[PDB]
């Protein structure tokens, strides 16, 4: 119910506050829906479900120099298409469940 | 200016609820330190036509 | 009796000189707690958390459990440093009492007193060896 | 809560006060799930009548 | 002695298997129990007298 | 009834479907994807997930 | 090419041990090969891991004041892994007589 | 390491409640009747 700010149309569906241990099994079975559909080999973003917090937002990489400097390179995804397709299915489920 | 660490942040550190530095922070150097033999590099530096 | 009681509470103190170790805090998916991360041990799970009880009929021990505050259960404040590693410590509210808890905390305090940083252990060993052998301790956060 | 002298076995309100069954209740789902062993024997037989 | 020896090198090799283990602090860890047993005996004798 | 690719005619495509049964039967085996393994029967879904 | 993901470092075995002095002949052939294979590695402390590897050897022929607190002239040259441990004599040779 | 509830005072029942089933029933609901181990122990008198 906290975390990242996506438009959530499924919201009256009762769901408890997902902690980091429970967001693993959500994130693991979503990246297992891309390895079954597109049949990739190798990691394909599943690393995000085996350690650390799965509620990732704005993934970024940085290096800390010794002289008190840190170069964050924020890499966000550009246009997203399946998520644009998912948000219309998720807003049709609340219309016709 | 010599780089000390390389960190991957799932969420930028101003907004993450509980600090979770990347695990690569724990390593002594800033990457996977494979050792190399300097007496094997120095053969390929002095020979090699 | 005083000499026998003091030699019994010495055995009460010494048998409690342990370190509290954190097991896994699995979330509760059922509707009894719903989301508050309890501590799944096997017949001790229903004996450690009286807040998670089912009270079908108004019995005298279930009359007391009706006043149990529902949020005061499970972990409260996971203090984890490194993402992907073990947490440093957690603050839970299980069935443990205060008297035994106080003894256990003191034992943890004792270990902390006789513990030095890695910039001190290498400054002890290299001085206990008269700098014949000087050693390197890596400079990265051992949590 | 069952009462001893034949007085009907009532159940607990929201504010923890035993009100009688024969009325119209509003069981929230969570409650039904943790009391279906006592829903099925006391209040739901007072539904079918 | 040996002819060409370095006394800061020959001791660095001979004291090598000593400090490679944490047996140097067994005498240190034993002292923190000979203390706590001593106070809890002096407070156990003198609380009976 | 939502039976995805019921009228397909191309190739295998992607091994993934939501073949919901009609509501005369029980449509419960497609709502136990995430936090519903082991502790639940094959005739009920967890409403908290 | 993959620097930052994986950095090759000099081995902790082919360093001359700091107890050994430079009068030992096969302990300077380990230090000669260390300097020639110095810039080949992508370890950013390979200046200090090469420079202090000599200064471990002649640590009584040429005694020096390694100004970092905690690190003594004989401290082995695999210890210098952080930029705070770069000795101030190395950063400016005017502090070395 | 302990890995257990750091308690030392076990709530026990030394005098069990009667499982009376012919005369005078419904007065005593054992927790175990519904298949659950009760958190606080049930007995006529529960000592510590």
CSV table of C-alpha atoms in Angstrom, one decimal, chain F:
chain,number,residue,atom,x,y,z
F,1,UNK,CA,-16.6,-17.1,-19.8
F,2,UNK,CA,-12.9,-16.0,-20.1
F,3,UNK,CA,-11.2,-18.8,-22.0
F,4,UNK,CA,-8.2,-17.2,-23.6
F,5,UNK,CA,-7.3,-18.3,-27.1
F,6,UNK,CA,-10.3,-20.6,-27.4
F,7,UNK,CA,-10.6,-19.7,-31.0
F,8,UNK,CA,-6.9,-19.6,-31.9
F,9,UNK,CA,-5.6,-21.3,-35.1
F,10,UNK,CA,-2.0,-20.3,-35.4
F,11,UNK,CA,0.9,-22.1,-33.7
F,12,UNK,CA,1.7,-23.1,-30.2
F,13,UNK,CA,2.7,-19.6,-29.2
F,14,UNK,CA,3.0,-19.1,-25.5
F,15,UNK,CA,2.4,-21.9,-23.0
F,16,UNK,CA,0.1,-19.8,-20.8
F,17,UNK,CA,-3.7,-19.6,-20.5
F,18,UNK,CA,-6.5,-18.5,-18.2
F,19,UNK,CA,-9.0,-21.2,-18.9
F,20,UNK,CA,-11.7,-20.3,-16.4
F,21,UNK,CA,-14.5,-22.8,-16.1
F,22,UNK,CA,-18.1,-21.6,-16.5
F,23,UNK,CA,-19.6,-20.4,-13.1
F,24,UNK,CA,-21.7,-23.6,-12.8
F,25,UNK,CA,-18.4,-25.3,-11.8
F,26,UNK,CA,-15.9,-23.9,-9.3
F,27,UNK,CA,-13.5,-21.3,-10.6
F,28,UNK,CA,-11.0,-21.4,-7.8
F,29,UNK,CA,-7.9,-23.0,-9.4
F,30,UNK,CA,-6.9,-19.8,-11.1
F,31,UNK,CA,-6.7,-17.6,-8.0
F,32,UNK,CA,-4.0,-19.5,-6.2
F,33,UNK,CA,-1.0,-18.3,-8.1
F,34,UNK,CA,1.0,-16.5,-5.4
F,35,UNK,CA,0.6,-17.0,-1.7
F,36,UNK,CA,-1.6,-20.1,-1.8
F,37,UNK,CA,0.6,-23.1,-2.0
F,38,UNK,CA,0.4,-26.1,0.4
F,39,UNK,CA,-1.7,-24.5,3.1
F,40,UNK,CA,-4.9,-24.4,1.1
F,41,UNK,CA,-7.2,-26.9,-0.4
F,42,UNK,CA,-8.1,-27.3,-4.1
F,43,UNK,CA,-11.6,-26.0,-3.4
F,44,UNK,CA,-10.9,-22.6,-1.8
F,45,UNK,CA,-9.0,-19.4,-2.4
F,46,UNK,CA,-7.3,-17.2,0.1
F,47,UNK,CA,-9.1,-13.8,0.2
F,48,UNK,CA,-6.2,-12.0,1.8
F,49,UNK,CA,-4.1,-12.6,-1.3
